[PDB]
Design a protein around this nucleic acid. Structure first.
Ligand SMILES: [Mg+2]
Ligand SMILES: [Mg+2]
Ligand SMILES: [Zn+2]
Ligand SMILES: [Zn+2]
Lengths: 1362, 49
RNA sequence: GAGUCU
């Protein structure tokens, strides 16, 4: 059975007969009365084998007494019935028939090889026109179609001088005659004279084919089939339904059409019938053969009785319901069950409730095995009945097997690996699975009737794999983010919250207790509340410089409940951890603290003990939910009446015709959105600090103990957002479109929505629930694409010896630091020796892990940016090194060799997109954007530091910015970036560049619902290409007559003014142009589409005045749905519609000639005297102002960067940082935590291939893109041995393409495009040596990674050593 | 004087399933949907209470 | 085809 690799080739007519064990010459299946195989039928026993084991048809030879005996009477071999699914057959077609995969599957293969159009070949196949195979005199050209009339011309005139024929015979003789060696030479030699792009693309692909066609051992004859193979009977079964009806596969029906038409064709050739009749039959043969192979491809698919089309052979290989995706990359499994899950709050974190009757049926063979050993059952049949009767002795044995024998639990959907965890079973009474509450987060399992699948690890390997890797207690941190997934929620948080939180006096204030046990004594004795301020003696163990724990006793001012909670806390943590009122966010840090200080064992016990006490004290509290708990502020009707009058004001000014519809729409949303903020601020102010209590002194106040508030403040369930809808204001509801409804709901759920308010609410309800069902498939398809590219990637090496990495500046974006350097750089090998500011003593070694200890020192010395070893920068050919990846985020320590990073990386990206599509959608009703970013207020004092800014001073006396991507920093005392903002175009700065500002100062100010076009020069406005009706429109009012002009774009524009560009040209008093300072550019600002203009022609202007106002309608609430397409496009490496232009080579710019508006740039670098020219559109106003020392990758046009242009000009590290930052910004908007290394994993696979420019010393030469890994292994031998070095360029690939580019065709055909992959592999004669995981999962082998890593490399040394 | 017609009943925008939800006015549309759909799945008991 | 968990 065992083997090395699998190969695909075309089937020779000779090869098809080798597989066959007899020819099916009849369409008959079975005799209707004596149900047996028919004489040379589709289900023939003489050809495919006997129905019973070792039994001929007539029944002359039975059983193994006659071993290898072929009966003389019926003609049937006495062998196993197994031979019926294995032996194939054949049909000798009277006439050749083209294979549809080597005809329709574009590129046509048969057409690409003949250089003859597919249309032209089909005319020959359906007998419309003849084709010249070999015109003796070159009067008749080869491969020239002759019509039926044009065939009659040559017939009388020439006759034998030409051999033009028709049908598949003609195309096969045409493929026979062609010489691959002679035509290939000619294509090579005749490409030299022209040398273009599409010739060199198509002629080089033809050379690659002709060369691969020879070396593959394939012949172009085999494109056309002379022989048709038959599938074995058992694989297309005719089996009896329980009742007398039978059932058959759709292949039997397609085989019968082919045999009937082939047999009839032979008879019509015997009858020497006219060709008209013979042709019709040849057409029908082609149709039946093409329908057998791929039904729905050439024409209308042949439907059977049901009206649906008959399922073809190709169909059982292709797509989802194909063998690959459904019966091979995934399977039905023995020793599996499922049931409705329920809580098990008594259970430990390593346990799960497994029902009696489930476990009985699950562990059947292990019980029969113990029953023989204990001597209770003689045979297995005896043991079977003992278990079926459910004897008392059997329950005791079942209990014996299950101890220390884990079970796997799974939930749909399996988004990430924690969707399967291992537990030790606890047998229970009922029929329902009991799941541990803490792992509920990983499964996303709520008990409202979820079902979870059970799997028994049978083998000892599997019991150890379950216990060592997949056990719940082993899997605490998330592999996506270095943070615990096992984190208490719901009642547990609420209980520890209620315990720790303090209250005014209460029972027994200012007491003094001996220990945490006397605190439990006064609480259970009923002399103290959990909230009483008390002095308590507590002894905290803090860890020393060495491993030893140091004990420290001290009086602590904490409540009774806080003292009781310290009892759960292990020795190692400070008492400071339980001294605060604990919520969900703090409790998560408790187990993260405990994990890094103590270990795994303490955390598992601590996490449990937290769970137990948390539930218990939640129950003690009697926290509840009443209608009075939903307090509404008394001043709500006051806020609404004010806000109603404000909105009525803009609507009354709209009737006057002062404000437009779009302006009112955006302006009204801002008033209501701030009113919802006002009501909610009043609600949370009248809710949070509402408790005013009388202490033993006089009177004071504290946080309210309103039951709903506690539930949202603790973070147990709900948030302030939900409480708005309950007590405050419901808010702006979202349209199904995504845009915001202008009328928001004033009322809340306590007050009740009226008939219309509900009807408005439903718009947003259905759209959310709609995305939960529909849009999950776009997101889940991303998970799939990401896995297929990263699949094969595994840690292969300990240390690559590379010195490279990506420089990780801290993500300080939008005032507060969004992600510190510490978080981003934690658990990563220090690429370069990064010391302290004073470069005179190294602080951190080059090859060392970044532990939280080292990360704390980075904050002490204030390391700003750190170069860090990345996955992308690894120089490992085989996979990746342990150092480049760094820490396993799930384990908190160095990653192991053998662990499969590709799949872990794809899952971590794919999961939150997929699950969040179902999260804030079922939960979502209301819209809540606040995109009203009017002004930046700086918060700390600093010097103003702008970058990538070019501003100009206006008439008012204000620094107006005339650059798109302007950034504003906030520099402290010593000189480091604390805050960062995005200042937009046409914004008014308070203070210019370098000036000091105070804290709480408006440093910038602008209008958000408008993108102004601001001038750089003063003078008068001129109208150019601004014809009324063609390019712009006009609308006037009354008495005086103020008219506004609105620029039409290609949508609202006629064919007349299409190539006209509308622009407001600047001129002086005389009428001439005004040059922009220090440039030869006459001043001309191009207005885009839908640009509203107030100033008409002939108006005086200063510099800094707004010429036109481009509307900025973006009222869509950004959920996962609007950001995921961005993420998909980034990973798929798509250029945008308007890519920004970048400088290719460093050197001195000179502007050049022009094409009727379109610019040219003949840039002549200092070193490279040879020039580089490139065309630029008219309308793109350039950032660079010509004659300047421009370097590689300098933004010339403003706008979005193609990731191709980044990698091409600024290397790998630039494009990696572009993808990581751009993708991660989308997930950061939604609060999703994904480490950069997981994106970096997939980026590495995107940077797989590379195009070879200069010739090598192998067979790369020019144009042939090969994998990076392969060309480097050649370069290692070339640098030492010598000969021609191969110059290269790394190319970027999208996911869907990088997956199909892999050499493993089995990986490619299992992904997508199954029909195309198999044909391109068949013609190239490719051999897949089963490299990656998909390949071994298919063949049913051990994975070449994880536990099997060690085993696969052991086979690989057997292969090397002899 | 500008009013031409009026809704006949308070219940007319809702269905038969949703009419049987008490205090529907204080329920979210998302939960109200599932509630009306599960009310249909409610198996009748031994004693009709 | 009508549902259940996401
Ligand atoms: Mg739930
Ligand atoms: Mg559920
Ligand atoms: Zn026989
Ligand atoms: Zn490496």
């Amino acid at each position: 059975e065992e083997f090395d690799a699998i190969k695909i080739a075309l089937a020779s007519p000779d090869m098809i007969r080798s597989w066959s064990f007899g020819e099916v010459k009849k369409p008959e299946t079975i005799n209707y009365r004596t149900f047996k195989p028919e004489r040379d039928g589709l289900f023939c026993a003489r050809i495919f084998g006997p129905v019973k084991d070792y039994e001929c048809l007539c029944g002359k030879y039975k059983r193994l007494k006659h071993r290898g005996v072929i009966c003389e009477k019926c003609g049937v071999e006495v062998t196993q019935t197994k031979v019926r699914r294995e032996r194939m057959g054949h049909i000798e077609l009277a006439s050749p028939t083209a294979h549809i995969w080597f005809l329709k599957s574009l590129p046509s293969r048969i057409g690409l090889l003949l250089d003859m159009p597919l249309r032209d070949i089909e005319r020959v196949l359906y007998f419309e026109s003849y084709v010249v195979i070999e015109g003796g005199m070159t009067n008749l050209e080869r491969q020239q179609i002759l019509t039926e009339e044009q065939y009659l011309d040559a017939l009388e005139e020439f006759g034998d001088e030409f051999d033009a024929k028709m049908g598949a015979e003609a195309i096969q003789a045409l493929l026979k005659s062609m010489d691959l060696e002679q035509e290939c030479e000619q294509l090579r030699e005749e490409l030299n004279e022209t040398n273009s792009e599409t010739k060199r693309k198509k002629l080089t692909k033809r050379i690659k084919l002709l060369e691969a066609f020879v070396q593959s051992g394939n012949k172009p004859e085999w494109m056309i089939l002379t022989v048709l193979p038959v599938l074995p009977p058992d694989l297309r079964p005719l089996v009896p339904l329980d009742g007398g009806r039978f059932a058959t596969s759709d292949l039997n029906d397609l085989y019968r059409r082919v045999i009937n038409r082939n047999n009839r064709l032979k008879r019509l050739l015997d009858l020497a019938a006219p060709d008209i009749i013979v042709r019709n039959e040849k057409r029908m043969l082609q149709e039946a053969v093409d329908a057998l192979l791929d039904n729905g491809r050439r024409g209308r698919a042949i439907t059977g009785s049901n009206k649906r089309p008959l399922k073809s052979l190709a169909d059982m290989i292709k797509g989802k319901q194909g063998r690959f995706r459904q019966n091979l990359l995934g399977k039905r499994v023995d020793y599996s069950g499922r049931s409705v899950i329920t809580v098990g709050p008594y259970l430990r974190l390593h346990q799960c409730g497994l029902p009696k009757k489930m476990a009985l049926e699950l562990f059947k063979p292990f019980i029969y095995g113990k029953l023989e050993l204990r001597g209770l059952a003689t045979t297995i049949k005896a043991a079977k009945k003992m278990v079926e009767r459910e004897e008392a002795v059997v329950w005791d044995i079942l209990d014996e097997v299950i101890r220390e024998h884990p079970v796997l639990l799974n939930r749909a959907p399996t988004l990430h690996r924690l969707g399967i965890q291992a537990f030790e079973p606890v047998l229970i009474e009922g029929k329902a699975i009991q799941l541990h509450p803490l792992v509920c987060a990983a499964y996303n399992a709520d008990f409202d009737g979820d079902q979870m699948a059970v799997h028994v690890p049978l083998t000892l390997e599997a019991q150890l794999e379950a216990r060592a890797l997949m056990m719940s207690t082993n899997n605490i941190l998330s592999p996506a983010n270095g943070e615990p997934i096992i984190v208490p929620s719901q009642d547990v948080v609420l209980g520890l919250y209620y315990m720790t939180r303090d209250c005014v006096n209460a029972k027994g204030e200012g007491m003094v207790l001996t220990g945490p046990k006397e605190a439990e004594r006064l609480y259970r004795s009923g002399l103290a509340s959990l909230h009483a301020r008390v002095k308590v003696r507590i002894t905290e163990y803090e860890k020393d410089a060495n491993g030893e724990l140091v004990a420290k006793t001290s009086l602590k001012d904490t409540t009774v409940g806080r003292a009781i909670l310290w009892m759960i806390v292990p020795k190692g943590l400070p008492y400071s951890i339980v001294n605060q009122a604990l919520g969900k966010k703090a409790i998560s840090k408790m187990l993260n603290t405990c994990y890094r200080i103590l270990g795994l064992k303490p955390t598992v016990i601590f996490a449990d003990q937290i769970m137990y006490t948390g539930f218990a004290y939640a129950a003690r509290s009697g926290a509840s939910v009443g209608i009075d708990d939903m307090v509404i502020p008394e001043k709500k009707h006051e806020i609404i009446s004010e806000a109603e009058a404000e909105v009525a004001e803009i609507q009354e000014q709209f009737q006057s015709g002062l404000v437009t519809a779009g302006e009112r729409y955006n302006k009204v949303i801002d008033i209501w959105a701030a009113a919802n903020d006002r009501v909610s601020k009043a609600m949370m102010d009248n809710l949070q600090t509402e408790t005013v209590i009388n202490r033993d002194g006089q009177e004071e106040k504290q946080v309210s103990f309103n039951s709903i508030y506690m539930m949202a403040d603790s973070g147990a369930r709900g948030s302030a957002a939900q409480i708005r809808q309950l007590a405050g204001m419901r808010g702006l509801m979202a349209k199904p479109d995504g845009s915001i409804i202008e009328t928001p709901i004033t009322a809340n759920f306590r007050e009740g929505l009226n008939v219309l308010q509900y009807f408005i609410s439903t718009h947003g309800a259905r759209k959310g629930l709609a995305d939960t069902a529909l849009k999950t498939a776009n997101s889940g398809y991303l998970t799939r694409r990401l896995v297929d590219v990263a699949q094969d990637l595994v840690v292969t090496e300990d240390d690559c010896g590379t010195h490279e990495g990506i420089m990780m500046t801290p993500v300080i974006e939008g005032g507060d630091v969004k992600e510190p350097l510490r978080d981003r750089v934690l658990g990563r090998v220090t690429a370069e020796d990064v010391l302290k500011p004073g470069t005179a003593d190294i602080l951190v070694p080059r090859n060392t892990l970044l532990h939280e200890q080292w990360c704390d020192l980075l904050e002490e010395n204030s390391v700003d940016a750190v170069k860090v070893r990345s996955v992308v920068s690894c120089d490992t050919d085989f996979g990746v090194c342990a150092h480049c990846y760094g820490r396993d985020l799930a384990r908190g320590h160095i990653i192991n060799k053998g662990e499969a990073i590709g799949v872990i990386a794809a899952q971590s990206i794919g999961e939150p997109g997929t699950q969040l599509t179902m999260r804030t959608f079922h939960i979502g009703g209301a819209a809540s954007r606040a995109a009203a970013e009017s002004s930046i207020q700086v918060k700390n004092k600093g010097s103003i530091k702008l970058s990538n800014v070019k501003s100009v001073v206006n008439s008012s006396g204000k620094l107006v910015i005339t650059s798109r991507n302007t950034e504003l920093k906030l520099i402290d005392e010593f000189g480091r970036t604390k805050e960062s903002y995005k200042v937009p175009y046409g914004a008014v700065l308070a203070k210019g560049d370098g000036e000091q500002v105070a804290g709480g100062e408006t440093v910038a100010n602008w209008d958000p619902h408008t993108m102004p076009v601001i001038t750089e020069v003063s003078g008068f406005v001129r109208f150019t290409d601004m014809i009324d009706g063609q390019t712009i429109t006009r609308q006037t009012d009354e008495l005086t007559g103020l008219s506004s002009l609105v620029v039409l774009d290609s949508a609202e524009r006629t064919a007349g003014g299409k190539d006209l560009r509308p622009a407001l040209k600047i001129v002086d008093a005389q009428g001439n142009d005004v040059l922009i300072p220090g440039t030869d550019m006459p001043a001309q600002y191009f207005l885009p589409g839908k640009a509203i203009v107030q100033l008409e022609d002939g108006v005086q202007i200063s510099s800094g005045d707004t010429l036109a106002r481009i509307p900025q309608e973006s009222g869509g609430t950004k959920d996962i749905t609007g950001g995921l397409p961005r993420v998909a496009d980034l990973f798929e490496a798509r250029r945008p519609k308007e890519p920004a232009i970048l400088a290719e080579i460093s050197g001195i710019v000179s502007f050049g000639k022009e094409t009727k508006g379109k610019r040219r740039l003949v840039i002549t670098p200092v070193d490279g005297s040879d020039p580089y020219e490139e065309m630029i559109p008219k309308w793109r106003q350039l950032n660079v102002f010509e004659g300047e020392r421009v370097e590689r990758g300098d933004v010339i046009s403003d706008g979005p960067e193609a990731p191709h242009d980044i990698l091409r000009l600024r290397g790998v590290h630039a494009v990696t940082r572009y993808i990581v930052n751009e993708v991660q910004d989308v997930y950061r908007l939604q609060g999703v935590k994904i480490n950069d290394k997981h994106i970096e994993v997939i980026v590495r696979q995107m940077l797989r291939k590379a195009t070879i420019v200069n010739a090598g010393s192998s067979d790369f030469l020019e144009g042939e893109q090969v994998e990076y890994s392969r060309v480097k292994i050649a370069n290692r031998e070339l640098e030492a041995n010598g000969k021609v070095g191969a110059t290269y360029s790394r190319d970027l690939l999208g996911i869907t393409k990088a997956s199909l580019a892999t050499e493993s065709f089995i990986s490619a055909a299992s992904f997508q495009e199954t029909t195309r992959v198999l044909t391109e592999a068949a013609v190239a004669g490719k051999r897949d040596e089963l490299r990656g995981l998909k390949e071994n999962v298919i063949v049913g082998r051990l994975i070449p990674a994880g536990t099997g890593y060690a085993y696969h490399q052991d086979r690989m040394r057997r292969r090397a050593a002899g | 004087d500008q009013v031409d017609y009026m809704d006949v009943s308070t219940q007319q925008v809702v269905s038969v399933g949703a009419s049987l939800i008490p205090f529907l006015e204080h329920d979210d549309a998302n939960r109200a949907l599932m509630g009306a759909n599960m009310q249909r799945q409610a198996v009748p008991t031994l004693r009709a209470d």
